């Protein structure tokens, strides 16, 4: 007698992890970037760059 085409069934689980990294920024160089008070020359200074 013949044979039948067998097959199997597999169930797998998703194992969860997570990575993280961080940096900072100095309070002295905070307002130097976003601060829109600098009118005419500090907007193209060297320390801003």
């Amino acid at each position: 007698p013949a044979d039948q085409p067998v097959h199997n069934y597999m169930i797998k689980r998703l194992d969860r992890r997570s990575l993280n990294a961080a940096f900072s920024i100095a309070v002295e160089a905070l307002g130097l970037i976003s601060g829109e008070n600098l009118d005419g020359t500090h907007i193209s200074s060297a320390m801003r760059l």
Partner: peptide
Amino acid sequence: VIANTNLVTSARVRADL
């Protein structure tokens, strides 16, 4: 004023005096 290395070569207040 903050310049790079580029180079060239009133009111009436109350007071005592």
